[PDB]
């Protein structure tokens, strides 16, 4: 948000570990998924609802911590000029 | 606080004066916390092993009189 | 070979390793998983194997056989590879009708994805992981080969002439004690 | 019938397959349990009309 | 059936159902899988050990 | 002893139960995945002594 | 038996135990399965083939 | 120093002036990497890669007279 000129964006860091399919407590047709490559700890997955340039990629290598690998999600709806419900009738 | 570190896991120990740890102040460390873990990590609250040691002494005493509750 | 990335299986016949004992509050393995069906396959295809024999006919697979030496076989159960299976697949494959001509079924693996079929994705109403993917699916289908050895032999003709029949069943291994 | 709404038991022996192979970072279908059940009782029933009829006495 | 392992989230939670099938004695029901013949409440055909009708037919 | 309290597995043969019928956004026990190949494992052992004993070489 | 696709000791590494069944060789454990009976060192009864009591009852 | 970074698993390759890593400063540098290092992520310090080179060099001087150990 520092980076960006605007501190209003919606902006979020998840976690796909928290989603790792445990025998019990996880519902078997529910969210979790099994555990591999990317639902894996130490791996992020960062949200940014603004357009941005891909230096912001190095920007985000100066803050994460060591050993964690980096992933980032363009949402186009957050940027789609006024209101995105599109109308036939 | 004790703080014991695991590969891909962090679980803290905490406890009161009385030894225990409410749910309450549980939520809290963890809410606390939440600004503090590393990114990608995964964070674990728990009560410190708390174990009561039951003592019945016998005490020889020279002043028999002074014997009493007090 | 499936101990390979995609599926990593890990079982091996020479460990001795007989049961998967799974435990609470662990991330499941989908190694797990395939090495568990992979157990019991195997020693179901060793009970076979200690009766039946590879080329051995059960019931039909009746054959038929034209003017022009073209071959068909009807449908039937036959032994092949720790699995009885129910043969229903209609080859044409023809002969020379010249010297010791052997016809025999032949096992292709295949894998089967959601991308190519896209039953195979979870259609469980109203849930998140709805038309997600998920596992895939091992094909096995028999075709008819002639003069292959590495197919198991059903029938073996010579001039074009049939040079052994059998009625009814075939078992090995019984039928070399009752010799 | 397992092949409705509440199971979805997706086995059916003409198409011939065999294994359910599973595979990382996907989530897990109770259908797919359910086959991988299904086709081993499936073989063994197979296995064990080629050799007894119903009512053997042992 | 409820999960009864002690101290985990999913403690007392429902689970997979069970396919129970249990066999009962029936007479003159042709659904059902023969296993004695009478005529005139007398035996019809005894078998002193296992019957195992694909090997019957080899062995006839 | 598989029905101890690490497993928990609830086959017996007395109960005439002979697949595990999953169910969708449920737990998944592992005393049910265990069960699961007991049963099988189970009528392979049965079907085994129908024709063979223990010791017999093949 | 740890988890393959990370390869390396870890809190979600662990997962679910195998029963291993090895065979051995015994003397006179009358619990154990025979395969052999000998008389003063000297082998008792022969099988040429495959063994089956069942099948074997049925074919006497 | 030169940080090799993985998925969950760091890789320090450090070295002194001669490019060798003695035990006693592997120790240390560990030491200091405590309060530094992200927890819960494996860390592993090692030696450089050094490659020890040798080299005889023939010259030729134009001033013959200049030859000599200086």
Known sequence: KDYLGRDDIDVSVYEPFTNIFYTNKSHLNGEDHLMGYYYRFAVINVSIGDYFPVEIIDVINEFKPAGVTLYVTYDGASTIRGGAIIKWD | VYVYEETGHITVFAHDRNGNLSDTLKEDIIDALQDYRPSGIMLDVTGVEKEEVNVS?????????????? | NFKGSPYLDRFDPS????????NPDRPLQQAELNEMQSIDQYYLKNLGDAIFKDGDKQSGLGFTLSEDNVLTVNPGYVYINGKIRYYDNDDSVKITGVGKETIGIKLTERIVTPDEDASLLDQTSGVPSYFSKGADRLEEKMSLTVNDPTSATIYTFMDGDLYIQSTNAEMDKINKVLA
Request: charged share 30%.
């Open chain 2, 57 to 70: 002494a016998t005490v020889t005493i020279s002043n028999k009189s002074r014997i009493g509750d007090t």
């Open chain 3, 15 to 22: 460990k001795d390793r007989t049961k998967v004992l799974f």
